[PDB]
RNA sequence: UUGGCGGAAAGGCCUUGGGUGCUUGCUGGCGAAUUGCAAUGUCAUUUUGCGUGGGGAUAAAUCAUUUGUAUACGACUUAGA
RNA sequence: CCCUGAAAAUGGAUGGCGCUCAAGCGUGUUACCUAUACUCUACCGUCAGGGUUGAUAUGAUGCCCUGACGAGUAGGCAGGCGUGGAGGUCAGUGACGAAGCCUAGACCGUAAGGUCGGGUCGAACGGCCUCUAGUGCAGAUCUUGGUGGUAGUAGCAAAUAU
RNA sequence: AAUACUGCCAGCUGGGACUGAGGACUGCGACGUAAGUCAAGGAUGCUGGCAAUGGUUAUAUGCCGCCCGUCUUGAAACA
RNA sequence: AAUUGUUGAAAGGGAAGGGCAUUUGAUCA
């Protein structure tokens, strides 16, 4: 959602040219972040390795309002409330156990060929 | 057969050479064309100059930067000729075009390689004796090309170097022929002659 | 355990979809003949979808035949399963979706006892 | 149409290869003399060779012999029509028109 | 021996097609060294193989081959018609295939 | 019942196939295929290697030899469609090939479940091969360059057209 | 390893001396199989990361403030350890 | 044959590239490519000509044999799928899960449609032979409800000023 | 005399592609003095490999493909 | 369902969407 918005040099670090400085959304996100941090502290997760692994913003039911236009016409003037959710997680990913054996099927000619290579090579 | 085929542009009709090279590229053979400034077109110099002026007249009215790009170099003229022959819009045509490499003169990575001529696209073999032809280099330098002297000097230097190389090769070939003649008149030679080789 | 039958061939393995089904959401994926005066599908031009025709049928010998060579029969109880006692070579039982597991296990046991193939053996069963 | 005088060899080849009869308003192939005798024995014709003879030499029962035979459905010529435009006269360089004895080659190519 | 080849090089030109309609079921193969149908009527019934490579092993090897046979001659330039068990992906209009010498009658 | 009843059930009685008038006849080999002929194999492990035709087995595969002191192909059976018969021929008179037959090369079909997921030759077979190749080289040595010819392997070079090559 | 030539895209070529193999130019010996009548029957190259040894040095840009030869915002042009 | 006659407005048409003992023009001869065209074969449907109560054995509206054909607006006829209800039957299914919904999962039927596997879910539902209709949507500037591009855009600039 | 051209062979033969429908016998024919056999009212024998072929969907490639319904002789229309 | 946000997969030189056949990726008896 950056149609017909102004450009700035503060967004150059992200590679984009059009960026803004929202206020209400930033305060709401910061409040929910502090709530998540408090929840993690209460649960027992240290804040050293906590990273925001999920976030989601959906549209809430609209609060209908009214506006007045020319020639005695009534138009649509509601809001767009947000449903915000977020999940922070402790980061821990060193290595896995890979896949299974993945047994291959060998033709008789293929088996003879590998036997020949084994017999010939040291 | 050869992975890359080098074709000289001397005395070669532009249309016939373009058709042959386009067919080969569509078949899947890598082709590099050298000395494209010596290509010859049937008709007189004034005829081809008028044709090129007619081509130049065509341009987009509202924005001339989006109109037909009338390239002036002989190599670019040859490339445009082949592009008018190959369907460049399709991916297969694009691949055929990237298979092409057209240069003016004899590049450094191609001076020391064998050059091949097209017997069915040569002016001396197709045009009637006494018919008027033109030179692509002269047409380009009269239309707006500005690098006629540079390529001429480079070609002269390359010709001198190749003449020295051919003198050395001819000496070596004479020595090899003398060695073969001495090796002849032997039993192996008679058996080879009887068996053909 | 199938009777010797000719190899099953299908003249049209694809699904006949209605025109503009992928263009408009109101148009479902159910075939409807185009009755428009200028409909390209109805006029059968080149490069458009193919209307179903009488020629796209299947051989009556290999019609209604599953790839395993057994006709599909829907069963709901042990008494229904007893119908295919002397016809297990051509017909295969199929438990409907409304039968609970307590009857499904009995139906499967009876089918195994009588040598009747079931097209859905792993249905509503513990993993 | 293209029409011409046929020969015995091409008549025999046509009758042998694409020879079909008309029995009970059906195109039953002729692979035995029994069917020909059953459907044409009243006219003295009882074998495929007799039918070919009646075709080549016009006789008392040529009308019935020809009516018994289904029209021969030939294919396109194997070696081509030999002309660039079929819809021109034979003297004008096409397949349209009388071909006289030249019809034998075209018939055998198409058969 | 520096060369170990038991086949004949061929180039996949295109399918048996027309001005605006093409038939993927039949392809056209050009044989190097053949210029007329008189000598093209020697590689008839021979097996053509397209030998391509993928990045995933199927049954121990990453090289997969598509097989077909020569059916008849196409044109006066030595091009022949080919019928494959699976039609070529049409991305190989100019690729190199191997025409084997079997079944050999000579 | 979800489905009421099939009105008529097909009878589950198999029908015998009709009598077929398709007899078998012996294979008619090509005129260029005659015992003692030098052959080049096109497909298989020993492709390109040159071999000698000895006997026509009843199963429509030619008995062929790769005499072991020349190139190492064993006494085997080869299909008629995977061999090119060269012009040169070395006779095989005095070489007994009556012992070799179809049941000589017994497959002994491998076991089903136990596949070679990981990890031989008969002394009788070695003995028959030695007996054959002794006389084979004894006759072959009478003419020059045949041993080296058969030891070398056939290959196709650039500019070689099989339709114009008289193998 | 010594030297020379090549700038158009040189990025390659020639050459000097030694070492490491082969040599089918000719004459011998040894083994080739149980891969079963064909089933590409691999050995070439285009990138990314990983692991092992030798080798080369420890930098800039943007935002922030400000300048004005610049401008709607961008952007341009400057400066301040 | 060619040339003057022969001049119209965005930049362009033998399609263009291009072609000159032509790849231009007239004529003569072969080879080559293809239409849902022609010949044969496999399958489906329709029509016509027939056989088949000497059976346990049922569907003679069933089965099989032979031949021919298969385009199509308005329109007619015929054969079939599905929806809301009622009668007979399945002594039908189901709280250990009925209906509904979701499901680039599977099967059958050329097709309308049917069926299975999994998740959600919570009290009803289905097959067979018939009767009945308020029985099938893609449009009618269709009636109602909700939702998108525009769009975080126009704009929130009269009335002296914080 | 030979040869060119045309037409005939119920003369022979080499190579390649598609198709395998029907399912105990019924008929028309040939070989064989005779048993019996056959290319004679629709393909069988042997052998090899695997227990990958193939179905659905996404992308890619070669070709084709104008927007649904109505009015109209004429629709995709700048109706 | 229209619409919207994240995760997972694919494509994107002035459109997307479809048909004829296949390669590759995912999945399937």
Could you write out the DSSP letters of every residue in C70-122? -EEEEE-SHHHHGGGSS-TTTEEEEE-TT--HHHHHHHHHHHHHHT--BS-SS
E61 phi and psi angles, rounded to 5 deg = -135, 145
Nearest residue, CB atoms, C75 vs list F2, F6, F14: F2
Separation CA C109–CA C127 (nearest Å): 18
Give the minimum alpha-carbon distance from B91 to chain E in angstroms, rounded to a whole number: 9
Contacts of A103 in chain F (CB under 8 A): 117
Q: Which of B37, B28, B30, B45 minimizes the C-alpha distance to B9?
A: B37
Alpha carbon D49 to chain centroid, angstroms: 14
Residue of C46, C43, C44, C49 lying closest to C31 (CA atoms): C49
d(Cα A67, Cα E81) in Å, to the nearest integer? 75
3-class DSSP state of B7: strand
Resolution of this structure in Å: 3.2
Q: Of C64, C66, C124, which is closest to residue C95 (Cα–Cα)?
A: C124
Residue A55 bridge partners (DSSP): A86
**Which of the 8 DSSP states describes residue A38?**
H
Q: Is A87 exposed, middle or buried (0-12, 13-18, 19+ CB in 10 A)?
A: exposed
Structure-token match 């492990």, residue found: F45
E64 touches strand J (CB under 7 A): yes
Of F164, F149, F143, F125, the C-alpha closest to F39 is F149
Residue owning tokens 């074998």: D47
As a dihedral over the C-alpha atoms of residue F101, residue F103, residue F108, residue F109, rounded to 10 degrees, the angle is 90
Find chain A residues with C-beta within 8 A of F117's C-beta. 103
Q: How many CB atoms lie within 10 A of CB B32?
A: 19
Which of A102, A103, A104 should be substituted to probe chain E, the one whose Cβ sees the most E Cβ atoms within 10 Å? A104
Bridge pairing between strands D2-3 and D97-98: parallel
Q: How many other CB atoms sit within 10 Å of the CB of residue B45?
A: 15
Q: Which residues of A touch F116 (CB under 8 A)?
A: 106, 111
Q: Report yes or no: F102 and F58 within 8 Å, Cβ to Cβ.
A: yes
How many C-beta atoms surround the C-beta of residue F85 within 10 A?
22
Q: Are E13 and E29 spatial neighbours (Cβ–Cβ below 8 Å)?
A: yes
Across the E:F interface, residue pairs with CB atoms under 8 Å apart total 54
- For E54-93, letters b (16+ CB in 10 Å) and e give eeeeeeeeeeeebebebeebbeeebbbbbebeeebeeebb
C-beta neighbour count of F92 within 10 angstroms = 21
Return d(Cα E29, Cα E7) in angstroms, integer: 14
Pairing of strands A74-76, A66-68: antiparallel
CA dist C6 → C2, C9, C12, C63, C89 (Å)? 11, 9, 18, 11, 15
Cβ atoms within 10 Å of B139's Cβ, excluding its own? 21
CB atoms within 10 A of CB F74: 16
Task: List CB contacts of B22: < 8 A, sequence separation 6 or more.
Answer: B82, B85, B86, B96
CB contact under 8 A, E94 and B27: yes
Instruction: Nearest by CB to F81, from E1, E6, E103: name it.
Output: E103
* Cα dihedral C112, C114, C117, C120 in deg (nearest 10): -50
A5: helix, strand or coil: coil
**Which tokens is B11 given?**
């005395």
The CB-side HSE value for E47 (13 A sphere, CA atoms) comes to: 15
Q: How many residues does chain B have?
A: 197
Q: What is the largest CA-CA distance in chain E?
A: 48
Residue A51 structure tokens: 């990273």
Nearest-by-Cβ selection for F1 from C4, C80, C91: C80
Q: Find the residue in A nearest to F119 (Cα).
A: A115
- Burial of F64 per CB tally in 10 Å (0-12, 13-18, 19+): buried
């Amino acid at each position: 959602f950056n149609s017909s918005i102004g450009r700035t040099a503060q967004g150059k670090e992200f590679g984009v040219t059009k960026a803004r400085w929202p206020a209400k959304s930033v305060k709401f996100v910061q409040g929910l972040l502090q709530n998540a941090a408090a929840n993690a502290e209460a649960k027992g997760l240290d804040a050293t390795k906590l990273y925001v692994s999920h976030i989601q913003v959906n549209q809430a039911p609209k609060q209908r309002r009214r506006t007045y236009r020319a020639h005695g016409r009534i138009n649509k003037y509601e809001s767009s409330p947000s449903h915000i959710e977020l999940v922070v997680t402790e980061k821990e990913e060193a290595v896995a156990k890979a896949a299974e054996k993945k047994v291959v099927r060998l033709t008789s000619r293929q088996r003879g060929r590998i036997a020949a290579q084994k017999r010939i090579a040291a | 057969v050869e992975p890359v085929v080098v074709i000289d542009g001397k005395g070669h009709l532009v249309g016939r050479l373009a058709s042959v090279v386009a067919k080969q590229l569509l078949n899947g053979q890598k082709i590099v064309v050298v000395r494209a400034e010596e290509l010859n077109i049937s008709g007189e110099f004034f005829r081809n100059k008028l044709k090129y002026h007619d081509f130049l007249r065509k341009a987009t009215a509202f924005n001339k930067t989006r109109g037909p790009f009338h390239f002036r170099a002989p190599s670019r003229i040859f490339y445009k000729a082949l592009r008018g022959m190959v369907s460049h819009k399709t991916a297969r045509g694009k691949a055929a075009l990237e298979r092409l490499k057209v240069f003016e003169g004899i590049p450094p990575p191609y001076d020391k390689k064998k050059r091949v001529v097209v017997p069915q696209a040569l002016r001396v073999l197709r045009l009637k004796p006494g018919r008027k032809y033109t030179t692509l280099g002269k047409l380009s330098t009269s239309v707006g090309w500005k690098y006629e002297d540079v390529v001429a000097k480079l070609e002269a230097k390359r010709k001198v170097s190749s003449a020295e190389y051919y003198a050395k090769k001819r000496a070596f070939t004479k020595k090899v022929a003398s060695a073969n003649a001495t090796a002849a008149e032997s039993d192996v030679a008679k058996q080879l002659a009887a068996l053909g080789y | 355990a199938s009777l010797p039958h000719p190899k099953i061939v299908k003249k049209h393995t694809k699904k006949f979809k209605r025109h503009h089904s992928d263009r408009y959401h109101r148009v479902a994926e159910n075939w409807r003949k185009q009755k428009g005066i200028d409909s390209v599908v109805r006029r059968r031009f080149r490069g458009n979808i193919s209307q179903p025709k009488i020629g796209y049928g299947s051989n009556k010998k290999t019609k209604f035949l599953s790839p395993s060579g057994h006709k599909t029969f829907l069963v709901a109880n042990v008494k229904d399963l007893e119908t295919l006692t002397m016809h297990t070579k051509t017909y295969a039982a199929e438990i409907a979706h409304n039968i609970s597991a307590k009857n499904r296990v009995v139906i499967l046991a009876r089918a195994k006892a009588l040598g009747i193939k079931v097209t859905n053996p792993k249905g509503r069963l513990a993993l | 149409v293209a029409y011409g005088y046929p020969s015995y060899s091409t008549i025999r080849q046509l009758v042998y290869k694409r020879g079909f009869g008309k029995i009970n308003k059906q195109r039953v192939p002729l692979s035995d003399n029994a069917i020909i005798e059953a459907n044409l024995g009243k006219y003295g014709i009882l074998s495929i060779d007799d039918l070919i003879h009646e075709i080549i030499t016009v006789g008392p029962h040529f009308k019935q012999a020809n009516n018994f035979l289904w029209p021969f459905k030939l294919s396109n010529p194997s070696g081509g029509w030999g002309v660039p435009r079929k819809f021109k006269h034979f003297i004008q360089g096409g397949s349209f028109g009388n071909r006289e004895e030249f019809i034998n080659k075209l018939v055998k190519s198409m058969n | 021996a520096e060369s170990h080849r038991l086949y004949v090089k061929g180039k996949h030109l295109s399918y048996q097609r027309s001005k605006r309609v093409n038939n993927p079921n039949v392809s056209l193969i050009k044989i190097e060294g053949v210029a007329t149908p008189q000598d093209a009527q020697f590689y008839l019934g021979k097996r053509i193989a397209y030998v391509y490579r993928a990045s995933k092993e199927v049954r121990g090897s990453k090289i997969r081959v598509m097989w077909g046979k020569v059916t008849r001659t196409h044109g006066n330039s030595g091009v022949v018609r080919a019928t494959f068990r699976n039609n070529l992906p049409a991305k190989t209009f100019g690729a190199s295939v191997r025409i084997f010498l079997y079944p050999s009658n000579i | 019942t979800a489905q009421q009843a099939p009105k008529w059930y097909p009878s589950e009685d198999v029908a015998a196939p009709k009598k077929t008038r398709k007899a078998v006849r012996p294979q008619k080999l090509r005129a260029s295929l005659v015992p003692g002929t030098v052959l080049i194999l096109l497909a298989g492990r020993f492709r390109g290697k040159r071999v000698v035709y000895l006997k026509h087995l009843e199963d429509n595969t030619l008995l062929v030899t790769g005499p072991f002191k020349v190139n190492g192909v064993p006494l085997r059976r080869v299909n008629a469609r995977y061999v090119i018969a060269t012009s040169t021929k070395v006779s095989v008179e005095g070489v007994n090939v009556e012992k070799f037959n179809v049941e000589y090369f017994a497959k002994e079909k491998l076991t089903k479940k136990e596949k070679k997921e990981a990890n031989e030759i008969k002394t009788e077979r070695v003995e028959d091969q030695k007996v054959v190749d002794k006389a084979l080289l004894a006759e072959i040595k009478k003419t020059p360059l045949l041993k080296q010819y058969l030891s070398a392997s056939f290959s196709l070079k650039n500019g070689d057209k099989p339709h114009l090559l008289k193998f």
